[PDB]
RNA sequence: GCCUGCGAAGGUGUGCUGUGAGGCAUGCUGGAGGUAUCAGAAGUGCGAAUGCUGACAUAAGUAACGAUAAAGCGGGUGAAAAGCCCGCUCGCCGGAAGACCAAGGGUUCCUGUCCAACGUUAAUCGGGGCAGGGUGAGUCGACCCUAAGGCGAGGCCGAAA
RNA sequence: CGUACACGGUGGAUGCCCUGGCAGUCAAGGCGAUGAAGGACGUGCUAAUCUGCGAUAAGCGUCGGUAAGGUGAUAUGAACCGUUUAACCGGCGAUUUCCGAAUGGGGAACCCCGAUCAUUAUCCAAAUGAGGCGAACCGGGGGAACUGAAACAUCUAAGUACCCCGAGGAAAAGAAAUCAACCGAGAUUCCCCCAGUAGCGGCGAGCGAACGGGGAGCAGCCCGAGCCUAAUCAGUGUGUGUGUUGUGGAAGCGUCUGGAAAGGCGCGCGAUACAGGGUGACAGCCCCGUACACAAUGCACAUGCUGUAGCUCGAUGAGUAGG
């Protein structure tokens, strides 16, 4: 269930999808491997999940002169649609 | 909920609670989508709850 | 010492004779009492000193030297307000020497 | 055994005294403490090591900016525009200042708002400052293996990394 | 443009203050493969640092203390918690992802498993040990040079620097085939003295004890047999003297200066408690604190006790003494 995911999407970019083409965009935490993003969505999103892909990402230290740069960003995943319903709402 | 309440609950009650709180641990996640009724109190409280019950579950 | 849950009585400032409770105490020694306030521009009941400028602290800036709480001496002051759950403090409060 | 916010130590200028090394007083300032006697004390009293460190003057408002030697004429915007933008005209480069990339650097990319700091002038310009956005592959690369060679384990050497 | 000064600036000395160092003293004293120290990287609504934790992430639970104020340093904005008595302080418990000496193997933190040596061995790693860290001190080995001798090969610096191995909170030594003023002393170290004497030395420069005495601390015993039970061993119960915090805690007085006294001046006081700090300017009698009092923990070194269990007889260690 909703434990690893941020903003649903943005304007023209994550909007071009979900329109009519079975696909969904949604930000998610970084510590999220493949276990979730299929076990936080698809659960109550009123839809079973499509070829599922759960990406991850993170930057790196540096960037400045003496400080605590060390960091680890966070990573959304593309979830197309199994052929059914577009999360009940959000879409065309 | 306080530790006292969880301890009183049965093994199944802690499971249904963890699950209820688990199902509960879903509703929120809507701010980034542009919500309002989302409260910051339970944001941090709920994670502790599902955890508190999780600690006692092992204590048993 | 001085506490926030106590009432003070002015004796020198132009607010001499005014009564009120202690709003708050700063690590500066000054104490703002509920009553000693000033009239701002747009006439807003807010305590502050009398001097031109931009942004300046509130409070009328009273001094513990001209105040009147529980002074063990002959003065013109009278009664003054003062915890209770302590118990031991109740004994001192009962004594006409301390509080 | 005394002096002090009816104000001290210190500092500046000045008066007096001592052979002097100095003491002392006045005015201004400072505005917190500071002395005399006898006695003991101290890492004690200093211009002259191509001395050490920091600061500063004269020198100088003197020296310097040079094969890709190209800007110019109008116009636009602006409080300011000789080098921000438009048009025309005039030129440079062509294995090259073109196009695609490795290593390396690393967000410096794009948009908006500005410029105090950076740009050997100015700047309403920027690879500058601030806030956002951008790098969505099974078939691209990593990931995997191996060559010279190296390492760990058993065998053998006072001992052993 | 010379020189002095005045006003302002540059600059930063000086005077004062200082949440810091330096030094001495008392107490206390190990951590880890139940995977520590350290580091990496997360974590607070915003936080870039530091600190605290670590994905129940500057936090969770219990008991006790404490207390209304609290949500670390930053006194910001927003905002939360607390009397279903929090914050804070002390102890303890629960949990504690992945990587990580980890050892399955490789590897600049990423992917799959008890690796290696060794003992026991139901030879099945099945049951165990070693493999790391830590300020100095300590024990057992290896072992210089420059330098001094105003040269230098003995000597000297050195048995030091450094290197190898290892224990503890303490080690090493040690009960005498010793000492040797004596009808005597009499386990071994350490401190003082005896000695800078004896002794050594191109006897050149230099080098350099011990016996004894005065002290600190005192403990003596075991390896063939006979016999029988209080050495020893195994186990059990389990301290007196405490650790931190809170409670029993007096006290702005007068005049003057000032925005304010922790000023000047006047007066009084504490003391089996004559450190220091804080509070609007030099307050031991404003606040904390100093002597003091009480409760929470750790250590509980010892003792007591159960079953073992005395005591007795003979001898006493050869490739050694010695060359």
Swiss-Prot record, chain A:
SUPFAM superfamilies in alphabetical order: Ribosomal proteins S24e, L23 and L15e
Gene Ontology CC, one term: cytoplasm
Record note on what altering residue 46 to K does: No effect on trigger factor binding
MF terms (GO), sorted A to Z: rRNA binding; structural constituent of ribosome
Free-text function comment from the UniProt entry: One of the early assembly proteins, it binds 23S rRNA; is essential for growth. One of the proteins that surround the polypeptide exit tunnel on the outside of the subunit. Acts as the docking site for trigger factor for Ffh binding to the ribosome (SRP54) and to nascent polypeptide chains.
Subunit note: Part of the 50S ribosomal subunit. Contacts protein L29 and trigger factor. Might also contact SecE and probably does contact SecG and SecY when the SecYEG translocation complex is docked with the ribosome.
Entry protein name: Large ribosomal subunit protein uL23
Curated annotation (Swiss-Prot), chain B:
MF (Gene Ontology): rRNA binding; structural constituent of ribosome
GO annotation terms (biological process): cytoplasmic translation; ribosomal large subunit assembly
Keywords tagged on the record: Ribonucleoprotein, Ribosomal protein, RNA-binding, rRNA-binding
Keyword Ribosomal protein part of the UniProt annotation: yes
A Gene Ontology term for the protein's cellular component: cytosolic large ribosomal subunit
Taxonomic superkingdom: Bacteria
Pfam families referenced in this protein's UniProt entry, alphabetically: Ribosomal_L29
Deletion consequences: Cells missing both S17 and L29 grow very slowly and have a rather unstable temperature-sensitive phenotype.
Iron keyword on record: no
Signal peptide: none
The family this protein is said to belong to: Belongs to the universal ribosomal protein uL29 family.
Function: Binds 23S rRNA. It is not essential for growth.
NCBIfam families found in the cross-reference section: L29 (TIGR00012)
Subunit structure of this chain's protein: Part of the 50s ribosomal subunit. Contacts protein L23, trigger factor and protein nascent chains. Might also contact SecE and probably does contact SecG when the SecYEG translocation complex is docked with the ribosome.
Protein name, UniProt field: Large ribosomal subunit protein uL29
Source organism per UniProt: Escherichia coli (strain K12)
Curated annotation (Swiss-Prot), chain C:
Cystine residue pairs: none
Superkingdom of the organism of origin: Bacteria
CDD domains hit by this protein: KOW_RPL26 (cd06089)
Keyword field contains Ribonucleoprotein: yes
Entry keywords, A to Z: Ribonucleoprotein, Ribosomal protein, RNA-binding, rRNA-binding
Annotated InterPro entries: KOW (IPR005824), Rib_uL2_dom2 (IPR014722), Ribosomal_uL24 (IPR003256), Ribosomal_uL24_CS (IPR005825), Ribosomal_uL24_KOW (IPR041988), Translation_prot_SH3-like_sf (IPR008991)
An example Gene Ontology molecular-function term: structural constituent of ribosome
Keyword Ribosomal protein: yes
BP-aspect Gene Ontology terms: cytoplasmic translation; ribosomal large subunit assembly; translation
Chain ranges passing through the membrane: none
GO CC field: cytoplasm; cytosol; cytosolic large ribosomal subunit
Physiological role: One of two assembly initiator proteins, it binds directly to the 5'-end of the 23S rRNA, where it nucleates assembly of the 50S subunit. It is not thought to be involved in the functions of the mature 50S subunit in vitro.
Similarity comment text for this entry: Belongs to the universal ribosomal protein uL24 family.
Quaternary structure note: Part of the 50S ribosomal subunit. Might contact the SecYEG translocation complex when it is docked with the ribosome.
Protein name per its UniProtKB record: Large ribosomal subunit protein uL24
Record gene name: rplX
